[PDB]
Design a protein around this ligand. Structure first.
Ligand SMILES: Cc1cc2nc3c(=O)[nH]c(=O)nc-3n(C[C@H](O)[C@H](O)[C@H](O)COP(=O)(O)O)c2cc1C
Ligand SMILES: Cc1cc2nc3c(=O)[nH]c(=O)nc-3n(C[C@H](O)[C@H](O)[C@H](O)COP(=O)(O)O)c2cc1C
Lengths: 183, 183
């Protein structure tokens, strides 16, 4: 698939089903994430692959975080069900470090860019995904399940799989005037 | 190029010269930025196109930022000279709004993803770019020059142009195992 076409028409997909990207297709997704722009080459990322019984362990972790947060019954139920919306989830942690020339937000930003690169590498291979976050990225229970230190941050849960719908190509390209200024 | 190839091999380039992307090719870069993932469709981005006399204006702005902060003459001179490292610069501001379901960091990451998408769109079309930031993204006078409110943030100065260095050997893709855990 053509690179410019992907960038101009990049779309996510929330309706995701088996098969998940696997083997070398999954490795391609992970390597795209590891090519994110990275001030100082700190490689400030850690990825967690959630699939098979990992999805159940993820469900239990989110439930516990929802209860620990004091969410209501609907919130706990949504957390329990959240992992089963895709066959594969990749949690991306910004693994940050004290550095003179690289503020923490730029390392967090690099990890965020890894999420989007990973979604586009799925899309490039006939899969798709959606970057999700929600309040439980800040849950102490959930942060501990992904080995976060105090200075680390969960920047996304990237749900991945085979979309029900081929990525639309009929929609027209975005327009620019509200957003672009000559300096 | 092929999309998966661009993502797996994505490289920035610091040594850039004329010709800058222009016309349709520049508009394609801007449309790619506007396809960034965006929680809640807040569209939380403003882009500033910096070229020709705008590059000189940008130079004076950065120079003033360094001077007001008390930098020495070498820091002031380096700020003054910074914009002339590329024929075209796109400043990206995260234009953030308070939404209970969309924390400000997610809006900032959408704007950061727009920078990367824009660099990839240059690369896809035979140009390239480098995402730069540095300490003067926080300078009050620089932020005012880009119309930042208190809740807004400069997330990058994207330097753009035609690569000057010869195309080098394709670099090895990274091993995924040190960064990846099965949850
Ligand atoms: C940091 C970040 C967090 C996001 N979190 C969510 C989320 O929790 N739920 C959701 O529906 N979309 C979320 N989004 C937006 C989706 O990833 C996606 O962009 C949205 O569904 C629009 O679809 P599109 O990407 O095809 O334009 C988030 C985006 C970003 C950049
Ligand atoms: C948010 C952000 C800000 C950055 N700022 C700078 C910068 O000011 N100077 C610089 O040399 N690299 C900066 N980088 C890293 C470069 O854009 C680029 O990734 C780096 O030169 C490595 O080259 P590569 O992208 O080909 O791997 C930044 C990266 C990010 C994500």
């Amino acid at each position: 698939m053509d690179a410019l076409d992907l960038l101009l028409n990049r779309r996510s997909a929330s309706r995701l089903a088996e098969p998940a990207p696997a083997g070398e297709q999954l490795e391609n997704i992970l390597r795209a994430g590891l090519r994110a722009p990275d001030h100082g080459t700190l490689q400030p990322w850690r990825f967690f692959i959630i699939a098979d019984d990992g999805r159940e362990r993820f469900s239990q972790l989110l439930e516990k975080g929802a209860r620990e947060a004091g969410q209501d019954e609907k919130g706990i139920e949504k957390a329990r069900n959240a992992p089963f919306r895709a066959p594969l989830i990749i949690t991306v942690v910004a693994r940050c470090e004290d550095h003179p020339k690289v503020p923490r937000w730029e390392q967090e930003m690099s990890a965020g860019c890894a999420v989007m690169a990973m979604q586009m590498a799925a899309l490039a291979q006939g899969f798709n995904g959606i970057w999700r976050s929600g309040a439980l990225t800040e849950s102490p229970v959930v942060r501990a399940g992904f080995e976060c230190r105090e200075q680390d941050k969960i920047v996304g849960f990237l749900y991945l799989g085979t979309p029900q719908l081929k990525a639309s190509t009929t929609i027209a390209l975005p327009d620019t005037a509200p957003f672009v200024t000559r300096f």
